[PDB]
């Protein structure tokens, strides 16, 4: 369950937050495939309750009402078409699995659902699954309010209701079997793995129970007994009863310590210096690399009050954002996930964005298609960070240096740093307020390389900065602190 199952050589996945199935299918063929992306993490493909107040927030999709593959992203055959078309071009699909809960206990009764299924939250009624009141924990919780009141007690965070969400009784075989049925159908459709949403709120044992019921991957694209990729969402920044190391037995885990620590470093807050990133990795208190799923930001914390507060960098902070994403991508620690989001009107009142609920680009609830401009950027308010040359080329960079050891670290004692990945790639950063001028050993074979951050190798030419490494592997680097993108990168396949 630890292996990503991506096509050999592909080392990252992108979160196409709220994209429609028809757009992802196309995106797979027109771009993800050609650009070496390993796979896509899609938003919950199961039916959820419809929220009109606020008007269709993104989070309504974390309130399941059934497991019918029917949502604002698309129907089941659209979903199927997408999995077939992405796999056929070497791009895996990973489903966001919301299995710890159904919708909010205080929702109205009726069919106000993405697929018209009926449900009565008040009575724990979900005929379309079907689930009854005895399929929920209600009695098992011991807090007075029935909700989570203290994260210092593992029992209530796993047996009580997260923000009113009807907590599913995952200890019951009936429940585990029903969830496995949903995930297995997905597997049979072609899905390569899952993100286990809100793992923190479930017992590791119940997870295991469900996981062990899962089928092997679809032999149409994978070899025989291939196990699905499992990466559990556990927000562990320390200071709590629950720790991520408790779920290592089920698969990998989201290391939120990563994005928090890196954001601070790159932002140069609290006296942090990039030169301190020499021992980046487990050394910094992080979980074991082969258990980590890393990212700079996620759909949740990029909205601020998530895991990491304002230290988390996002596309709003473009310049610095690209440097962090680039450092993570060049560095060997963990398995990387890049974020691809959508724009919305932020409105911070007393330190909190009260518009952070706003859902994906839409025309009266109907999600907008993702339009591609000739310059390869996206339209209709989709940010498409996964298409910024700076990030796109670094995903290629990671693919190219795969398996190569961290090497040739250099730093100017302040905020200028650089390192290599064996003899296949080198990267330099200038995060100081002054010019960077140095002759560094790149570990790369002599030659002329295209800087993949300022340009691209097209035909027999570079569109941007050219770096010349002499026979002895050294090269002169010059980056003004005022450069558009204060870091250069070159690799085996960017060599002219």
């Amino acid at each position, epitope marked *: 369950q630890y292996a990503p199952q991506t096509q050999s050589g592909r080392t990252s996945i992108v979160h196409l937050f709220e994209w429609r199935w028809v757009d992802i299918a196309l995106e797979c063929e027109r771009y993800l495939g050609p650009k070496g992306f390993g796979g896509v993490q899609v938003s919950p493909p199961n039916e959820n309750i419809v929220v009109t107040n606020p008007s269709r927030p993104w989070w309504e999709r974390y309130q399941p009402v059934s497991y019918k593959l029917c949502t604002r992203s698309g129907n089941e055959n659209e979903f199927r078409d997408m999995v077939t078309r992405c796999n056929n071009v070497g791009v895996r699909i990973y489903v966001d699995a919301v299995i710890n809960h159904m919708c909010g206990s205080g929702a109205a009764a009726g069919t106000g659902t993405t697929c018209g299924s009926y449900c009565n939250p008040g009575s724990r009624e979900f005929p379309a699954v079907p689930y009854s009141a005895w399929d929920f924990n209600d009695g098992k919780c011991k807090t007075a309010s029935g909700g989570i009141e203290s994260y210092n007690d593992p029992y209530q965070v796993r047996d009580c209701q997260l923000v009113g969400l009807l907590d599913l009784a995952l200890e019951k075989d009936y429940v585990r079997s029903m969830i496995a049925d949903y995930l297995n159908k997905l597997i049979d459709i072609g899905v390569a793995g899952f993100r286990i949403d809100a793992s923190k709120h479930m017992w590791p044992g119940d997870i295991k129970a469900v996981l062990d019921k899962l089928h092997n991957l679809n032999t149409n694209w994978f070899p025989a007994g291939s196990r699905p990729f499992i990466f559990q969402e556990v927000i562990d*920044l320390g200071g709590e009863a629950i720790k991520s190391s408790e779920y290592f037995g089920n698969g990998r885990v989201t290391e939120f310590k990563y994005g928090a620590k890196l954001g601070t470093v790159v932002r140069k807050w609290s006296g942090e210096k990039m030169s*301190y990133l020499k*021992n980046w990795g487990e050394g910094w208190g992080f979980m074991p690399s082969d258990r980590a799923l890393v990212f700079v930001d996620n759909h949740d914390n990029q909205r601020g009050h998530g895991a990491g507060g304002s230290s988390i960098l996002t596309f709003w902070d473009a310049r610095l954002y690209k440097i962090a994403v680039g450092f993570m991508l060049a560095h060997p620690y963990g398995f990387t996930r890049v974020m691809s989001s959508y724009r919305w009107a932020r409105n911070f009142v007393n330190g909190e964005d009260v518009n952070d609920w706003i859902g994906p680009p839409n025309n009266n609830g109907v999600i907008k298609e993702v339009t591609i401009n000739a310059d390869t950027t996206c339209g209709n308010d989709w940010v498409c960070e996964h298409r910024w040359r700076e990030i796109r080329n670094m995903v290629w960079f990671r693919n190219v240096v795969d398996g190569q050891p961290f090497a040739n670290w250099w730093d100017n004692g302040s905020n200028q740093v650089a390192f290599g990945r064996g003899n296949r790639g080198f990267i330099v950063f200038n995060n100081d307020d002054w010019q960077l001028s140095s002759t560094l050993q790149t570990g790369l074979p002599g030659g002329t390389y295209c800087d993949v951050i300022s340009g691209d190798k097209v035909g027999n030419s570079c569109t941007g900065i050219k770096v010349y490494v002499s026979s002895d592997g050294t090269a002169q680097f010059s980056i003004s602190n005022s450069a558009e993108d204060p870091f250069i990168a070159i690799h085996a396949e960017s060599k002219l």
Partner: nanobody
Amino acid sequence: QVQLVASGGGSVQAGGSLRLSCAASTFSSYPMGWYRQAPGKECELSARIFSDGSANYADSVKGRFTISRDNAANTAYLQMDSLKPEDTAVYYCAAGPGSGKLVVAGRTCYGPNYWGQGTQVTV
């Protein structure tokens, strides 16, 4: 419940020395550091010691301060030699896995999760 109690501190003349101590009742297998907050100034990381023993040092203290741990008593240490009046500020002991924050004087310090009450140093 973890509690980080810092010791040492006080006033001293320029060029003098001070040794700060931090006790913890949390073990010591993750990074522990020392931050300092001067009046009206941003919070700054002074020195950090990683599990393996390697350390980070603010360029302005490098060669003048020496961070260390004991393990045999769960105590971290920060020896401050050749003190300078610029070193005047409140020093906070900081430790733990993951990350946390310290909200002081309207400013927040992103760091190690657990902080100490802060000891006053004056040069």
